[PDB]
């Protein structure tokens, strides 16, 4: 029988949808070398080149759907014996420019999962590849040149016998694409940052190990005769002084076998090493179990009297610097039956009840 072809449902503009089988659109095969080091690009390609040479159920839907309202879920199945552990970080950025830095600092900012294979069997996270809208497409991200980067922030504390593979599995979930837009209002309820405060290596031993991280976060992170910059960290440095509840997210990057108890506290730079009364100050103790690899230190408004400067001159010493630091002090001793450092990654997630004062004319360097 004949029918009117103009009336048919061939103009189905609806997004990709269904179960997780029929929204899958690519898998990608990352190789973690037997002996991989820190700050080491494992994968680095454009997010559209993920889907090259793929034949899953939503692959042709993904390329041909003009609009997509849903987020992209990526999940990484990768595991290793408790004995060992490392720290991988997958990360999506809206683009690049010639000879870009792939330091964890630079990358983190926008949208990233960070996990320890030693503790987490698998790890998933969703994201919106267009960060200033509720929608996107395959043609948007191919021509916008969205960039995906997997990096190893800490090497294997104990190497596996052979090479490993992390299988990333890209789908489209049906969560709403919410936009993340930075703006110049002085008072904001939640200013996200994902500022990499730094990797803290603590060697095995009986020595008093103290590590300071300055909370004058603005003005990038350091390099040779240079500095690195995210957008969010450049954005907070718009303001001269600032304050708020700081939400750090401290992550274990070593194996469960390297054991150490870490006190965290706010305090000023003048405090020396071999000053054994750090627990006079208010503090939080952080023990990690075998399974836990992640914990959220929060430092309320009561830890700070005033706002402090976003930038300090790089030349100022610890002795003469009136902004607060975040100390990380080994409470007892770093231990383990296997050799390896107790690596630990601190990441300022964001500032709650952020209050930005003034207008920073600026300072050149970092620290």
């Amino acid at each position: 029988m004949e029918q009117n072809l103009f009336a048919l449902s061939l103009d189905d503009t609806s997004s990709v949808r269904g179960s997780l089988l029929d929204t899958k659109f690519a898998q990608t095969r990352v190789l973690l070398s037997k002996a991989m080091a820190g700050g080491d690009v494992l994968l680095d390609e454009y997010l559209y080149d993920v889907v090259n040479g793929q034949d899953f159920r939503a692959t042709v839907a993904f390329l041909r759907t003009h609009v997509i309202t849903g987020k992209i879920k990526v999940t990484a199945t990768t595991n290793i014996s408790d004995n060992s552990g490392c720290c991988l970080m997958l990360a999506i950025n809206s683009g690049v420019r010639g000879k870009y830095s792939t330091d964890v600092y630079t990358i983190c900012s926008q949208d990233s999962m960070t996990w320890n294979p030693g503790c987490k069997k698998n790890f998933s996270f969703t994201f919106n590849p267009n960060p200033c809208g509720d929608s996107w497409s395959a043609e948007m991200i191919s021509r916008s040149r969205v960039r995906m980067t997997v990096i190893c922030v800490s090497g294997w504390t104990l190497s596996p016998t052979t090479d490993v593979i992390a299988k990333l599995d890209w789908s489209i979930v049906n969560e709403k694409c919410e936009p993340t837009i930075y703006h110049l209002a002085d008072c904001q309820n939640w200013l996200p940052l994902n500022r990499w405060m730094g990797k803290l290596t603590f060697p095995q031993g009986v020595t008093s190990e103290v590590r300071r991280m300055p909370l004058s976060i603005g003005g990038g992170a350091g390099a040779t005769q240079a500095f690195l910059a995210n957008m969010p960290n450049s954005w907070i440095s718009m303001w001269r002084y600032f304050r708020g509840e700081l939400h750090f997210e401290v992550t274990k990057m070593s194996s469960p076998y390297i054991k150490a108890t870490v006190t965290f506290l706010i305090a000023f730079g003048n405090l020396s090493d071999a000053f054994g009364f750090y627990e006079s100050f208010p503090h939080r103790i952080v023990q990690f179990a075998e399974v836990e690899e992640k914990c959220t230190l929060v430092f309320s408004q009561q830890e700070f009297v005033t706002a402090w400067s976003t930038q300090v001159n790089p030349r100022t010493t610890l002795e003469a610097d009136g902004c607060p630091y975040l100390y990380a002090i080994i409470h007892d001793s770093t231990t383990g039956t296997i050799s390896g450092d107790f690596n630990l990654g601190v990441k300022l997630v964001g500032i709650k009840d952020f209050c930005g004062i003034g207008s920073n004319p600026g300072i050149d360097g970092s620290r």
């Binding site: 950025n93 420019r97 830095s101 703006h183 040779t224 690195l228 910059a229 957008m231």
Partner: protein, 196 residues
Amino acid sequence: GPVCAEASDVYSPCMIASTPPAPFSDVTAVTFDLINGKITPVGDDNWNTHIYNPPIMNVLRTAAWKSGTIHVQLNVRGAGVKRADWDGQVFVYLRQSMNPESYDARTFVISQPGSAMLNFSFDIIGPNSGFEFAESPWANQTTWYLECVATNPRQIQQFEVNMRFDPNFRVAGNILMPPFPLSLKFRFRDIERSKR
């Protein structure tokens, strides 16, 4: 008049472009890519260009998608040239593209002797919910360039583009940039270095 209107807010200096040194007398020009922070002088004229790193510029270089008004202040110096011997003009041109086919979005024309100032503004606006990715192939988005022409480079010694976000400004997305490198006597520091 003589009594002047009151200047106000913090403008941070983004891009200086000193003019080629003697004996180069010919007409010359320079282009400041205002968003991406790049300074391309015309042909093989050795202009001495620097892009500084105040918070404005680091945001403009790292932010992917941008929206809203930025106020510019183009300052011009300034040689030790008798006012009656002054014949230098400064023509500036806002443009979207650097291609021949595109027209200007604004032209200014200055012939103040010695030195000069020119405040203007322009709003970045784009397809993606009012946001513009500068020079993205997507939707053929484009930058804002600021072409500047010195008719007499012996008299006009340097350009200087200061900028300020209007309160309405908004960014989103990060770009992976390479490590930003760090940083005539028109200055207090530079006067000290020429006697030491």
